[PDB]
Design a binder for this molecule. Structure first.
Ligand SMILES: CC(=O)Nc1c[nH]nc1C(=O)Nc1ccc(F)cc1
Length: 274
């Protein structure tokens, strides 16, 4: 702190509190996160170089008085608050599609540098007046969690981010969370009831996962047409590939960018009341 005046609390993150603050030198308005190892130090410092138009810029890491503060580019609103704000008519599809396309771009970036987010969720997704959307708060909600994580895979891949983003995608379209678990088992079982209990056909190796049980109930898959009306056939094809059980079949961000759903992408501006 010190060289930064807290203007307000804007969140109580996973790894600490987030403040809007103003730099007493630069004059600059930033987002200041107070965290709470040399290893936390080295991976954090790797973040400072992961720079992309769809990634919140990490301005500075202050390791001082034996505390950790992260200084971030300030954005004025997150996608959760924009969703609650837009619930009556919903986010216009060209806006949903621009948002998805840019997040795919951020993820294409991170993933090509072997960085996973691990915890995407509408609250970590930040928006500006210019129509941009950025990824923040890189890795108690269970809702956007990939099923390989829920099944206890320890060495899971970039495909987890693709799964979270498809859940966010579906949520923007229907104005309700795709899979609102309130426990890990409820989360897993909600995924199962919509998509089918997975098996060796759709996901080789699933019955050998650590937390998999033969006693899991055996639900049938519902059809996507019922899951996210009124997403068009392109949107639905893409969403279906983002939600493949097998993380190895699940579409990449780079491949998803080439999907015909984006043939007509544009960059609308949202109407944001700050
Ligand atoms: C976690 C993190 O890095 N957050 C941020 C970085 N820049 N801006 C933020 C942030 O949380 N901005 C908001 C401002 C106002 C809101 F209502 C919500 C988010």
């Amino acid at each position: 702190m010190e060289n930064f005046q807290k203007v307000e609390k804007i969140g109580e993150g996973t790894y600490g509190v987030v403040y809007k603050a103003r730099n007493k030198l630069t004059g600059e308005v930033v987002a200041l996160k107070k965290i709470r190892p040399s290893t936390a130090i080295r991976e954090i410092s790797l973040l400072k170089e992961l720079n992309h138009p769809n990634i919140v810029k990490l301005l500075d890491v202050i390791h001082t008085e034996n505390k950790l503060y992260l200084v971030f580019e300030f954005l004025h609103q997150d996608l959760k608050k924009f969703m609650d704000a837009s619930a009556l008519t919903g986010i216009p599809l060209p806006l949903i599609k621009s948002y998805l396309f840019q997040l795919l771009q951020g993820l294409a970036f991170c993933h090509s540098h072997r960085v996973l987010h691990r915890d995407l969720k509408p609250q970590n997704l930040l928006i500006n007046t210019e129509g941009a959307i950025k990824l923040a708060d890189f890795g108690v909600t269970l809702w956007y969690r990939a099923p390989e994580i829920l099944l206890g895979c320890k060495y899971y891949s970039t495909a987890v981010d693709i799964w979270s983003l498809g859940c966010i995608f579906a949520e923007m379209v229907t104005r309700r969370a795709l899979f609102p678990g309130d426990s890990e088992i409820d989360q897993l079982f909600r995924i199962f009831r919509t998509l089918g209990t997975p098996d060796e056909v759709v996901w080789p190796g699933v019955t050998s996962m650590p937390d998999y049980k033969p006693s899991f109930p055996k639900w049938a898959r519902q059809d996507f047409s019922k899951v996210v009306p009124p997403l068009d056939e392109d949107g639905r094809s893409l969403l279906s590939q983002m939600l493949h059980y097998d993380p190895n079949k699940r579409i990449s961000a780079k491949a998803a960018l080439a999907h015909p759903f984006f043939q007509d992408v544009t960059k609308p501006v949202p109407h944001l009341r700050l």
